[PDB]
Amino acid sequence: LLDSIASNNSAKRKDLIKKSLLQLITQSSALEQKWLIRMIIKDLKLGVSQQTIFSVFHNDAAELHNVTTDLEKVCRQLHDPSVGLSDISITLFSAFKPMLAAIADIEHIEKDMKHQSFYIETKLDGERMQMHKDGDVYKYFSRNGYNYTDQF
DNA sequence: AAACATTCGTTCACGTGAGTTCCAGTACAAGTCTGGTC
């Protein structure tokens, strides 16, 4: 039902969205409808961190989610708790969580660089993107893993 | 020969250092909140 509603919103159709929501309402209880509303809004407020959920799911799941950024692969590969992954590293056509930068104090900057020469670069204002190229197959991914390939 | 002073092992009290348990405070991760823009 959620897939139908999302695709149908993407297709510029509202009568079908109304039908799907009506079916969900008619075939749900008050608590189920409340939870469904929370998932639609994309907030649950469970009080438990996503990192905790991933850790309980498998020993090495946060790293795999960072490298891949797709709940399907993490859920599929990490099924048997005993069986782990030998080596996890960036792979083609799979979004990876970008590496960010933290505030720095000009006074102790040299100390933060272990008293060694460093690189100074200009700050760029705009979107953060990553490009995957294999032959003439191109994929573009945004900061959080959304696919912007259609635009570019 | 008898009385008084000094000394020594003993006793009590008090003070100081080291080990154990319980609790206040701090740095940072993550959740949550919010503003502006097209």
Shortest CA distance to A83 belongs to which of A51, A56, A65, A59?
Answer: A59
| A105 CB-to-strand B distance under 7 Å | no
How would you label A77-102 residue by residue, b for 16+ Cβ within 10 Å and e otherwise? bbeeeeeeeeeeeeeeeebbeeeeee
* Residue linked to tokens 């705009």: A126
**What is the three-class DSSP state of A95?**
coil
Experimental method: cryo-EM
CB A152 within 8 A of CB A139: no
CB A145 within 8 A of CB A69: yes
Shortest CA distance to A91 belongs to which of A132, A58, A61, A144?
Answer: A132
Query: Which nucleotides of strand B lie under 7 Å from a protein CB?
Result: 29-33
Classify residue A68 as exposed, middle or buried by CB count within 10 Å of its CB (0-12, 13-18, 19+). Answer: buried
CA atoms within 13 A on the CB side of A12: 0
- The residue from A12, A42, A114, A123 that is catalytic is A123
Structure tokens at A90: 């960036």
Conformation bin of residue A115: beta by default, left when phi > 0, alpha when psi is -120 to 50: left
**Å between A118 CA and B5 C1'?**
89
Resolution of the experimental structure, in angstroms: 3.3
What sign does the CA torsion over A46, A51, A54, A58 have? negative
**What is the three-class DSSP state of A76?**
helix
Angle at A86 between CA A140 and CA A142, to 5 degrees: 15
Q: What are phi and psi of A133, to 5 degrees?
A: -125, 125
